[PDB]
Write a protein that binds this DNA or RNA. Structure first.
Ligand code: ATP
Ligand code: CA
Length: 425
DNA sequence: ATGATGACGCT
DNA sequence: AGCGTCAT
């Protein structure tokens, strides 16, 4: 009772750019704005692979991973923008640079953890404290939360429902209690409105966001009202929210562990986990996983927002599917050179921008036949940012994996070069 | 014939 | 070190 921690110590947000690559291409090309459109990678095989889809095109059933030729069957008017191709591979530089635009704005408000090219977590606890002292027990106006949903409220127009729930929420806040977790989340949402307004003003890009007490709840919250909206998930909203929430929706439970929770326990929803002891969960899923599940199904998680705005590794990969699999030594060598040249370009920019140098090169390949991501990984020293040296070193490291040949057997269906172990410079 | 990339866990 | 998992 009085000694059971409730996981309400922090205010955490997750910001997620809406259909990010589409927004980048729509900013650049106004003819794509407010249209069903998608971004496509490559072109020859079935019109290319769709990597991002505007919300107008999603209404027709267009999805990521679909072939553009197939997407045109669902949406004949679909407009397409093509990812840049350099040295025979997709080049995502435009989107990485757009991501930096957004991340740099977010960093003005708080310490961020880059979670992907277009997501970042925000630890707002200190900014909320400061903003709560600048307020003098002043009530928070609904005008300060013009795109916020309060999950679980109210308890026949979309915006009308949003305001009704927001009104119910604001009407019961303990405004004079500076330590009230619900009040802290509400101020957190005010700051996130300001952060999202600044992103849109300064880049043209819209995003969604979740505000809660931890990263898992903030990420879940973000997806509840997309696009261009933000959602506050309070501690008290967790029992009803989790009571019908498929386990797979919780971050890290979308794969084999989540499937085993469902199968071993015979449950479907996150809230059903509360009926097991911590020891029971640890017995089925291990000490770390069981302790994490025991707390998480109660809305409690302690994973910190890591102060990290830059990636820890810089990598370049390309798949070679079906008949395009690399089957000669000259082929393997040329593509390792192509990847190494793009990697050198990124590394040199990274050293100038971010005052660091990578010291290890990881080479990963996939062999025709294995359903895994990688068949083999080996490392070597990375001492000079030179594409010819890196590709020669990568070959030497993987040369012995060749059965016999001028020929390369079995053929390679993936090449991957990753620079790691950065040191300041 | 998805594809590109990145974090972190386990041993 | 090298492999497996999970994610955008
Ligand atoms: N299966 C995948 N393969 C490759 N890249 C992916 C994949 N899923 C996500 N990504 C990368 O993450 C970026 C953001 O993906 P996300 O799932 O957030 O979709 P989105 O296009 O931003 O739409 P939403 O509005 O739903 O967020 C994508 O542009 C892509 O670069
Ligand atoms: Ca996104």
């Amino acid at each position: 009772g009085p000694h059971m921690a409730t996981g309400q110590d922090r205010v955490v947000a997750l910001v997620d750019m809406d259909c990010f690559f589409v927004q980048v291409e729509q900013r650049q090309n106004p003819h794509l704005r407010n249209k069903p459109c998608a971004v496509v990678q490559y072109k020859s095989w079935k019109g290319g692979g769709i990597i991002a889809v505007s919300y107008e095109a999603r209404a027709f059933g267009v999805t990521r991973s679909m072939w553009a030729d197939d997407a045109k069957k669902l949406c004949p008017d679909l407009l397409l923008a093509q990812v840049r191709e350099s040295r025979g591979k997709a080049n995502l530089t435009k989107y990485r640079e757009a991501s930096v635009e957004v991340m740099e704005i977010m960093s003005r408000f708080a310490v961020i953890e880059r979670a992907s090219i277009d997501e970042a977590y925000v630890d707002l606890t200190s900014a909320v404290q400061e903003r709560l002292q600048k307020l003098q027990g002043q009530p928070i106006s609904a005008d300060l939360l013009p795109s916020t949903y309060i999950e679980g409220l109210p308890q026949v127009q979309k915006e009308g429902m949003r305001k009704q729930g927001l009104f119910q929420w604001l009407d019961s806040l303990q405004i004079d209690n500076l330590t009230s977790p619900d009040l802290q989340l509400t101020v957190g949402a005010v700051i996130v409105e300001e952060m999202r307004a600044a992103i849109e003003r300064e880049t043209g890009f819209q995003c969604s966001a979740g505000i809660s007490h931890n990263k898992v709840l903030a990420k879940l919250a973000c997806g509840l009202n997309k696009p261009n909206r933000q959602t506050l998930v309070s501690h008290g909203s967790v029992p009803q929210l989790f009571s019908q929430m498929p386990i797979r929706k919780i971050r890290s439970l979308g794969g084999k562990l989540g499937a085993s929770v469902i199968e071993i326990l015979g449950i479907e929803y996150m809230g059903e986990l509360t009926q097991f002891t911590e020891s029971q969960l640890q017995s089925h899923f291990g000490e770390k996983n069981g302790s994490w599940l025991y707390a998480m199904c109660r809305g409690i998680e302690h994973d910190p927002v890591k102060p990290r705005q830059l990636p820890k590794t810089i990598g370049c990969s390309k798949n070679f599917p079906g008949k395009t699999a690399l089957a000669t030594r000259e082929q393997v060598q040329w593509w390792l050179l192509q990847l190494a040249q793009e990697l050198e370009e990124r590394l040199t920019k990274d050293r100038n921008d971010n005052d660091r140098v990578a010291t290890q090169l990881v080479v990963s390949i996939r062999v025709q036949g294995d359903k895994r991501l990688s068949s083999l990984r080996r490392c070597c020293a990375l001492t000079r940012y030179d594409a010819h040296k890196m590709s020669h070193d990568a070959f030497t490291v993987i040369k012995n994996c060749n059965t016999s040949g001028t020929e390369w057997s079995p053929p390679l269906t993936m090449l991957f070069l990753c620079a790691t172990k950065f040191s300041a410079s």
